[PDB]
Amino acid sequence: STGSATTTPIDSLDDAYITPVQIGTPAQTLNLDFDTGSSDLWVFSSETTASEVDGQTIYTPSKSTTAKLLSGATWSISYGDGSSSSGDVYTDTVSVGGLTVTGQAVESAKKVSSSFTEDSTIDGLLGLAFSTLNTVSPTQQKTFFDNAKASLDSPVFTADLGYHAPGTYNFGFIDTTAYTGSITYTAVSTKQGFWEWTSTGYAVGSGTFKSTSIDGIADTGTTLLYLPATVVSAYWAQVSGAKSSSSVGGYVFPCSATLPSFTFGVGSARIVIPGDYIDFGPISTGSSSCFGGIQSSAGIGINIFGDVALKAAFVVFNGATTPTLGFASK
């Protein structure tokens, strides 16, 4: 089997991407944030504290003839950005782009933190990291991909995120028309439960390529590109007037600037992030200080190849017995 679904930016900055997902019988369609950096499929629901729901579409398990309470199961997650959610668990039928999994753990939120409430466009998350990170207790549950894997034509999914435009998540096949040149594959460590890999280096603008190993995670659920302070400083030094602002929470730059591109290495191959992808707009409405899309990972504890990086590529998440990651230009 295969599936194919369009993923759409939630706003004009590509802060996140939402993909429609069918849950239950009859189908209830929710717009979920597909997140290769976590492993829980959780939704706003009829059980979510009412004051914490503000415009989201909810899953109502009592209206699904295929929903079953997973007795005794609870979940609770805290994300790297400080947000969180928790609740109980149903199993139900979940379909993405024509690909159906029966008995998928659907984690129903009883509580969500303010950042979730305040984002009316995101109805929940669909985790696509390794199932070892799933938070359900006392019986850990599998991701949608893990459940689908054996039935897929090939044990893969691909992320093709757009810049200020829709893109695609495919399951079970590689669309050879969606990228240019060849796909370069690189090793993955699953030791921390992430799609963790090692970039071979970087360049800033038209500058020379610096060969240096950068361990990090391919994370569709993180907006920006978080890299070591040395790398980030070298980038922003090429933008007149750019500076790290402790009050704002990262590097800012004059909105009048033209940003240089940023290149990262995948083996001997190179992915070029155009400068415009690194512009996250005014820090507050009307400001002439703009927020940068490349930021320091110092104090995160891990480097993160988030949407800024991934949207410059066609990315293969290869879930074969030994997982790997593939990147192509597009």
Curated annotation (Swiss-Prot):
Residues 17-328 form the Peptidase A1 domain. Its EC number is 3.4.23.22. It is an enzyme of class 3 (hydrolase). The keyword Protease applies. The keyword Protease applies. It catalyses: Hydrolysis of proteins with specificity similar to that of pepsin A, prefers hydrophobic residues at P1 and P1', but does not cleave 14-Ala-|-Leu-15 in the B chain of insulin or Z-Glu-Tyr. Clots milk. Keywords: Aspartyl protease, Disulfide bond, Hydrolase, Protease, Signal, Zymogen. Disulfide bonds join 255-290. GO terms for molecular function: aspartic-type endopeptidase activity. It comes from the Eukaryota. One of its GO terms (biological process) is proteolysis. The active site is at residues 35, 199. Belongs to the peptidase A1 family. This is Endothiapepsin. It comes from Cryphonectria parasitica (Chestnut blight fungus). The gene is EAPA. The chain holds residues 90 to 419 of 419 of the full protein.
